[PDB]
Every structure is written in C-alpha cells, then in structure tokens.
Nucleic acid binder design. Structure first.
Ligand SMILES: [Mg+2]
Length: 860
RNA sequence: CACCCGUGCAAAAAUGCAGGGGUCUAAAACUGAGCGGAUAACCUCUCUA
C-alpha cells in the first residue's frame, strides 16, 4: 500500500540538467546523495553504506532494491521524462501550476534548470499556507467577542495612541475598537499573550503590540503584499523595539517557568529515576531528563517511543484504575527509560528499528515491528517498570516532594532552552501565534513548520553538496538560516504545550461558563447576575464555584469553545439534534462508555441518543447543587461523589461534543482559507509569469478565468467549450478537457458577489462566528464538510436574501430549502476561484475527497 | 478511495496492469502531527479563582 521506493530507501529522485540524482534517507530527514544517473549510466555515490543498489537503469525507470531494513525492490521514474513519452524528450519538469520558473526567479534570482529548488519553494509555500490558516484563526479568536485586518508593524503604540484625539473618524474608531477590545474580558482566555504576573493584563503597549504582530501576520499570510512589506515575515529582524520586546516577554515566561527551578519541580521524577539509574551520575541523569522531558528528544529519534511504551505496557496490569493519578509519571519515566536505553546501549537497536520501519510496506508491518521491539523492551524492563510503579505511591510521591536534593546544575544548565534573546524573532512570533490556538492546532502548526523547515534544510544541504546555486535573494535571506530556524522551532515545539498561564477564573469567566452550559429563557440579566453572586458568594461554600471552575472554565474543550465561539452561540448550537448526534456517533464506543458509565445511574444507539438528549437538555440549574458534592472525592464510593462524577461526565461530554463540532468546522474553514491564500498568492505569481489575470479583490474567479483563458463578456462567461482552450491553459491542471469543461460550467454558474462573500466569510470566519443562526434548520449532517458548507450557504442566503441573485444562485438557495442540506453544486460554484488548482478544487468541492481521515467516493 | 506523471498491453484514443510523485491536496518515507472524542515542566481528589 505504501511506496516501495521509499521503503527501498529512495529519499528523492532529483533532476539537474541532463543528470538525475537519487538521494537516500539519512538521520531522520537528512538526505544524502546516493546515485547520479546520466542517460542509462549510474555513478555510485555514497559507496560505503549505500541505502540501496540500483541493479538496472533504463531511460524510463530505475530499478532499486533496498539494503537497509527488509530487502525490498522498487522501480522509480526518471524525472527528465516526467512530462515526456507518448507525447523535448528529457527536460527538467515544471510544477503543476507552471509557476516553477517564476517561483525560482522570485525566491532566488534566476531560473534553474533543475528539480530541487522548486521542491524547496513548495515547502516555503506550505509554511505560508499553515501560517495563513493560523494567523486567520488567531485573528478570529481575537474578534470572536476592520481593526485587526489593518494592523501594521510600521506604527508602534506611541503612534497608535495619538489616535485618541484624532480629528478623523477612521483613526478615532480604530483606536476605540482597540480600547473596546482590550477592555473586553475575553483577553483573559489569551492569558499567555496578554496576562503577566505583577496576574494583571499587560500594559496597553504590549496589548497593542501582540495584536499588531498577529494582524500583520494575517495580512501578510492572506493578502499578497507589495513593496517592502511583502517580505515582512522574513525581515522580522527589522521589527520595532516594542514588537521585539513583546515577543521576548511572551516567549521567555514559559522558558523561565520551566528552567528556573527544573530540579525542584521535577524532583519526584528525578529522584525515582535516580533510584533506577543508581550508577548514573545525578547531574547526568538530570541533564538527560531535561533533554527528554523539556526538549523532547525522545520524539526526534526516528521512532515512536510512545508507541513502544503502549505496546510494552499493554496488558501487563498497569491499565488498572489505581495508577490513573500515577499514569502520567509512569508513562513519562517508562519513555525516559526507553530513551536512555536507546542512546546508551541500544543505539544499534534504534538504528535497526528505524531502518525496518522505513523499509516496512504496511502499517501492519510497522505494528509488528513495534510489538517485537516492545516485547524486547518489556523483557529488559520488567523490574525497572515495577520499580517505577512501586516508587510512585501517593505517600511515596509526597515524601519525594518533601526531600532535599542539591543536584549540580552545571551539567543541566548546558541544556537549558534558550531564552528570548537567543531565539529568532520569527520563532518568537510563531510562539505568540501559538498563544491563540488549541493544543491540536498547536501541534498541526508547529510540527508542520518544523517539518517544512527540515525539508528546506535538507534541500539546501543537497544543493550545497551538488554545488547548485543555493543563494536565496537578498529579500529571502531568511531561509539561508533554515537549519537554525529548524532548531529553534523544534525547541519551541518541545515546550509549547508544556506551560499554561491560566488565571483565577474571573466573574465574567463564570458568566461565560453558565452561558455555555444553559440557562432557562425566563431568567433576566439581573437574575443571571444574582446566580453569579450565589456562585461567587457575592460561613461560606465555594463548592459550586469550584465545580464550575474546574469542570467548565478549566476544561480545554470549553477553553477552545470560548476561544472560537460566543458561549451563548455555542449553547444555541448545542440544540441542533442532528448536528450534535453526528458527533455522538463519531465518538467511538470506547469513548462513549467513559461518559455513560457515570451518566447511567442498553444498545449503543440508545446510549448515544440519550447522551445527545442530555446535551440538548443541559443547563446550569441541573448542576446548581454542586456546592454539596464538589467537596467529595471522585474516586470514592459515596453517593455525593457518584453524582459529582455523573455531572462531570455530562459537562465533559457536552463541552467535548461542542469542541469537536467547532474544531472540525474551524479546520474545514482552515482548508478554505488555505485555498483563498493560494488564490491570492498564485494571482501575483501568475501576474509575474505574464498571465493576464487582473484585479482579484473585485472578483476572486479572475485567476481561474485567466488560467482557462476565458473572460467575462457582459458579466457572464460567453466563451463556450472546445479542446483548444483546454490545451492552451496557463497551467498543467487545466490542460485536460473534462475538468476544464466542468470548471467552466461551474464558473458560469457562480457570481462575483457570492464568491466575494464566500471569501469574506471564510477568511473572517463569519460562518463560525454566527454558527447558531447558520445551523438553525438542518436535516442531517453526513459529514463535517457538509455541516460547514451548510453554514456557508446559509450565511450566503442570509446576506443575499434581500438582494438580486443570479438564476443559478437562486436555484442553489432554493435547493437549500427543498431538502435542508448544503448544495453540492453551490460548493463548486463558489469554490471556482481555486478551480485552477484542479486537485484543490476537487478536494474542496467533493465530499469524501475533502478529508484524508474519512475518504469517500468521487462524484465525477 | 482524488489528481498528475512513467512504463507494458488492449487502444485508433482511451481502459485494464504495474508503479512513481517533497517538485499534486491539509498530504513523500521514519518521526513529530492530525483524525481523536485529555494531555501537561507540576501525583491525584479536595483547597485556592
Ligand atoms: Mg506539497
């Protein structure tokens, strides 16, 4: 199922001039040159330890059998022939967009007769795509509740503050929007970015500088810019002092929190590991534990230590409920034992495991490999793991916490994560960006960024080894330090999720908490304020207060939900039975019994139905008696504790279902803001390439129309379909007649205003900002893609209900009500702006082909 | 179960086979990671808000 060429070890098959360079897998993603192929002749590079031998070379195929791992044989294609054969006959291929010459001429200073620089440039574009997703998400988080979309680094707070007495309404209203935002309590959910210990809100200067660095990032990543500001993400060393200082202060605090007293906070794990590693010096063990836990070196070593631990401790008896309070320490130190074993004594085994994982053809093969390695690790570490578990008793952890250890930090401090004065402004800004995401988004951003920078570094080293012109342009010299940025980003990914600067739950936080949970309609605003006074006690009982704080405010599900949704809006969206039920049967049985075992005191369909009924009929007053049972201990068998765990299961289920809905909707919108970022970027790229595209702000389909060669005559596309326009397209995607005809037909069925509104509700995330009203009447939710496009099309209907709509748009909106679901034709109608990129158009207009995790059938 | 590309055969211009694709998607292999519905320098629960 997986690629045999990768299993055989073929990292890449490049193409420079008439020669073809085959590269192999090094340490991780490092690429080492293996063979150079010049017209059916192969010259073996990397003679000692070759990853693969190539037993026969043809002009149209390189047969390669694998040395490393299982001896698998593969056939690989000649890149010079990538667009030749059955059509001069050997030329370096162009990218699908046919933008490769312009990308080379823009990132570097000249066209390149090879097939490596474009490979690097597409990874840079992937970087910008991910940042376009996540700066947009951060701005939507700040706007959830025309100002954040015009924030420029060029003006500091000392110049933005002069807009208090601005004689002009635009500047005065911008400053008033800034004040109305900082005065918002919602900044308390952005506490890492906006709250400092003195917890107080950061001063207005830092408050504004965070917003400027975030909004300018969004503007850069979505709007292709002109002038010096086009390279703003890469010329960040020119940031003003205020922005540098705010980047520093936001980045330093997790670093300072973790490495100020690493011995003290990690004393329990350090001591119990010193018990296992008696022969090891305590300073060495402390440095290794920093490397493992803070720096996360156990994840960079080319195999899943987490998978090995899970397969080793599968059924040995540590799945019992007793260790749940211990399980974090137990898993951490099992991973540490495995790690230290792999650097110290099982380095050969780690290499022999990475090789067989790379050479494996199936996930079943990877599973068997991990299982066998975990069997060996268990048989090696039965007593080590038993010692770890025994020395994690509650009394034992208490005594370990009270003990005094004066461990030498000289060897530890050589591994301390660099402070903000050493890391770069780009990675500091990336951390500041990460301050406005959930944890899953945290990973999807920072791990993808380290992947892309690692790819760029590997390409740069390959081109240096081949002697190719590696020099980026003076404006893109940022990527000449790609190795340094990769190191910084991996270091940041190590500790980005490790620190949470959570604040004491404010009164407005508690207001959001019950609003997201549900209140009876008849209760007035003063009544809700009186219930807040009851929670906060204006003898004393903070039981319900603490229950609401722990279960709702401190739940990252609710944290996410107030990051990207008004609590009242989320509560309203909790009332759509089809959409909540859809998440209900997406959560598996294993994760449904977790809630039902507490919400019960028989069939899974009935269980999910009643769970969804509870999500629909949930309110504060069902939990208003939490002052009685919150003081109980969930682990006990008292009825107060049982009811406490029941309410915890209900609240967690509701918040998690809403979290899943909102996260999936935001992810689907993230794919479309990728699409529109690509539209806007490729517009400028094609304009540089001499394509006649024109202004795309006015009409977002200008790019696809320019690529297809069609032009609207009197507002409608009057050019018909013929093979000539298909074959003379501006890119490889639309060289085919069938999908050219389909995209032309769907272009004729769209309109400028609807497409512009779709772009606006995608970038500004208004479809989610108004999720409650955009989800009112939905019949079923076959997938999150369907729900997102129903929200989008309902948003389009609401704005275009009292305006002139073309016949096709009217038919789409009528089909919206004829059966209450999104229009599978409207999606491809307003998705035409990125129809030029046929793969993206197909993915974003066809369900099943949208997401990788739930693949479905193509609708042709 | 997308798109494209190479090759072999049938084709009279596209279908079976076998593959490849970092240079096709959110999308190369190991990882990291997402899907995903607890993970986190900090035992847990209570406490503190
Ligand atoms: Mg790519």
């Amino acid at each position: 199922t997986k690629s045999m060429a990768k299993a055989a070890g073929v990292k890449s098959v490049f193409a420079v001039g008439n020669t073809v360079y085959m590269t192999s897998f090094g340490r991780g993603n490092d690429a080492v040159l293996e063979q150079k192929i010049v017209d059916t002749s192969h010259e073996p590079l990397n003679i000692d330890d070759p990853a693969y031998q190539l037993n026969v070379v043809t002009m149209n195929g390189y047969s390669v059998t694998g040395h490393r791992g299982e001896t698998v044989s593969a056939v690989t294609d000649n890149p010079l022939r990538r667009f030749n054969g059955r059509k001069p006959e050997q030329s370096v291929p162009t990218d699908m967009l046919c933008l490769k010459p312009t990308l080379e001429k823009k990132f570097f200073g000249k066209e390149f007769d090879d097939n490596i620089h474009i490979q690097l440039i597409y990874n840079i574009l992937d970087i910008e795509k991910i940042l376009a997703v996540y700066s947009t998400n951060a701005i939507y988080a700040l706007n959830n509740m025309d100002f954040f979309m015009k924030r420029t680094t060029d003006e500091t707070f000392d110049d933005f503050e002069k807009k208090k007495e601005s004689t002009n309404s635009r500047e005065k209203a911008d400053f008033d929007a800034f004040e109305k935002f900082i005065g918002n309590y919602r900044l308390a959910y952005f506490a890492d970015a906006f709250y400092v210990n003195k917890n107080v809100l950061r001063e207005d200067k830092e408050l504004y500088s965070v917003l400027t660095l975030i909004g300018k990032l969004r503007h850069w990543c979505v709007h292709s810019e002109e002038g010096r500001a086009e390279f703003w993400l890469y010329k960040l060393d020119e940031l003003k002092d205020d922005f540098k200082n705010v980047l520093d202060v936001v980045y330093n605090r997790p670093v300072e929190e973790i490495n100020n007293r690493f011995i003290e906070n990690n004393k329990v794990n350090i001591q119990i590991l010193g018990s296992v590693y008696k022969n090891t010096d305590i300073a060495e063990l402390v440095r290794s534990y920093y490397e493992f836990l803070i720096t996360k070196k156990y994840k960079n070593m080319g195999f899943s230590i987490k998978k090995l631990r899970e397969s080793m401790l599968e059924g040995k008896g540590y799945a019992d409920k007793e260790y749940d309070s211990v399980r974090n320490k137990l898993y951490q130190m099992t991973d540490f034992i495995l790690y230290t074993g792999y650097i110290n004594e099982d380095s050969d085994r780690a290499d022999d495991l990475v090789n067989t994982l790379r050479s494996s053809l199936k996930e079943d093969d990877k599973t068997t490999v991990y299982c066998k390695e975990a069997d060996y690790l268990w048989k090696k570490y039965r007593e080590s793991i038993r010692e770890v578990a025994d020395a994690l008793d509650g009394d034992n952890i208490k005594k370990l916490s009270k003990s005094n250890i004066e461990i030498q930090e000289d060897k530890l401090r050589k591994c301390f994560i660099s402070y903000a004065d050493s890391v770069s402004e780009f990675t500091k800004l990336i951390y500041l960006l990460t301050r406005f995401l959930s944890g899953k988004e945290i990973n999807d951003l920072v791990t993808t960024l380290i992947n892309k920078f690692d790819n760029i570094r590997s390409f740069l080293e390959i081109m240096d080894e081949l002697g190719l012109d590696r020099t980026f342009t003076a404006e893109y010299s940022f990527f000449e330090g790609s190795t340094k940025y990769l190191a910084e980003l991996v270091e940041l990914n190590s500790f980005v999720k490790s620190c949470s600067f959570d604040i004491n739950a404010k009164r407005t936080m508690y207001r959001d908490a019950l609003d997201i949970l549900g209140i009876e309609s008849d209760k007035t605003e003063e009544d809700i304020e009186k219930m807040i006074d009851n929670i906060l006690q204006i003898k004393k009982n903070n039981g319900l207060r603490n229950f609401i704080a722990s279960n709702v405010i401190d739940s990252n599900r609710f944290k996410y939900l107030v990051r990207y949704g008004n609590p009242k809006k989320i509560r309203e969206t909790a009332k759509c039975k089809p959409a909540v039920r859809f998440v209900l049967n997406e959560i598996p049985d294993a994760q449904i019994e977790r809630y039902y075992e507490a919400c019960c005191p028989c069939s899974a369909n009935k269980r999910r139905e009643k769970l969804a009924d509870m999500i629909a009929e949930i309110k504060f007053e069902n939990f208003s008696d939490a002052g009685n049972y919150q003081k109980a201990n969930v682990t006990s068998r008292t009825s107060e504790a049982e009811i406490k765990r029941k309410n915890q299961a209900i609240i967690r289920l509701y918040l998690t279902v809403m979290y899943i809905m909102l996260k999936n909707l935001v992810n689907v919108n993230a794919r479309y803001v990728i699409a529109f970022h690509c539209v806007e970027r490729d517009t400028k790229l094609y304009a540089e390439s001499g394509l006649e595209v024109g202004n795309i702000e006015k009409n977002k389909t200008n790019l696809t129309m320019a690529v297809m060669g069609v032009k609207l005559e009197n507002g409608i596309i009057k050019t018909e379909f013929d093979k000539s326009f298909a074959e003379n397209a501006a890119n490889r995607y639309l060289r085919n007649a069938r999908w050219y005809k389909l995209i032309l037909d769907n272009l004729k069925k769209s309109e400028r205003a609807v497409v512009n509104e779709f772009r606006n509700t995608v970038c500004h995330l208004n479809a989610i900002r108004n999720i409650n009203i955009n989800i009112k009447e939905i019949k079923e939710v076959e997938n999150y893609f369907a729900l997102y496009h129903y929200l989008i099309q309902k948003h389009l209907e609401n704005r275009f209900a009292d305006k002139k709509v073309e016949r096709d748009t009217g038919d789409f909106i009528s089909k919206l009500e004829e059966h209450k679901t999104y229009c599978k034709d409207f999606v491809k109608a307003y998705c035409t702006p990125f129809g030029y990129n046929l793969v993206r158009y197909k993915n974003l207009t066809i369900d099943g082909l949208f997401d990788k995790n739930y693949p479905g059938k193509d609708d042709s």
